[PDB]
């Protein structure tokens, strides 16, 4: 049979299942993004952006949301040191939940 | 002494339904006992 | 929370060991 290191070559000539495995990989990556953001949010210390900013807290995906304009939480705080801002749905939590739901939908499409 | 094939050997089977049942049982046992393991 | 320090490893193994037992048996079935 196939050696272990060749198992995935079964989709080499199967465009439908190649799309399927690409969908599953995309779902996994999007789910990682969502869950990583959720974890970082669950442990982020927002009180002191001066001497305890995100890069002192091992925050890996949070800076990437903030780079493109997602800088506030639903929970009231913003990584710019401010409070009481209203980001709308597109807060850190909103973005992470978006990635989770996307992961699910991609999973379902992969199954199909 | 010689090494003779043992004729008492039999295949083992676990069907897919049994797999799902066992996996659910293990998952629900874990759900139940994890809180006590953490205490 | 100050939980039992063996809690995570005990929970992971409690689930994983029978999970892999079942997985092995299922996958090899029909051999």
């Amino acid at each position: 049979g196939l050696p272990w290191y060749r198992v995935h070559t079964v989709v080499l000539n199967d465009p439908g299942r190649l799309i399927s495995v690409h969908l599953m990989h995309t779902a996994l990556v999007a789910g990682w993004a969502g869950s990583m953001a959720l974890y970082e949010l669950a442990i982020f210390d927002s009180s002191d952006a001066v001497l305890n900013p995100m890069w002192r807290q091992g925050m890996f995906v949070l800076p990437f949301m903030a780079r493109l304009g997602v800088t506030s939480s639903w929970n009231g705080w913003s990584v710019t040191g401010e409070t009481g801002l209203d980001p709308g749905f597109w807060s850190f939590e909103g973005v992470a939940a978006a990635h989770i739901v996307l992961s699910g939908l991609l999973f379902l499409a992969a199954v199909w | 002494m010689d090494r003779n094939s043992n004729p008492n050997r039999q295949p083992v089977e676990l069907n897919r339904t049994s797999l799902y049942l066992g996996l659910l049982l293990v998952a629900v046992l874990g759900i139940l006992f994890s809180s006590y393991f953490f205490n | 929370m100050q939980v039992n320090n063996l809690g995570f490893i005990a929970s992971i193994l409690f689930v994983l060991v029978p999970t892999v037992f079942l997985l092995i048996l299922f996958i090899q079935t029909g051999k």
């Binding site: 669950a42 199954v111 | 069907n15 897919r16 339904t17 799902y20 996996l23 659910l24 998952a27 629900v28 874990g30 759900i31 994890s34 809180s35 953490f38 | 929370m1 939980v3 809690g7 995570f8 929970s11 992971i12 689930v15």
Partner: peptide
Amino acid sequence: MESVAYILVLTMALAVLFFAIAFREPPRIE
């Protein structure tokens, strides 16, 4: 961090449900 363990076991149970439904052994008449 024990919350992660609880979420993991709950997710495992739910995933098992989804596969047991979607990917079940068909009942076949023969």
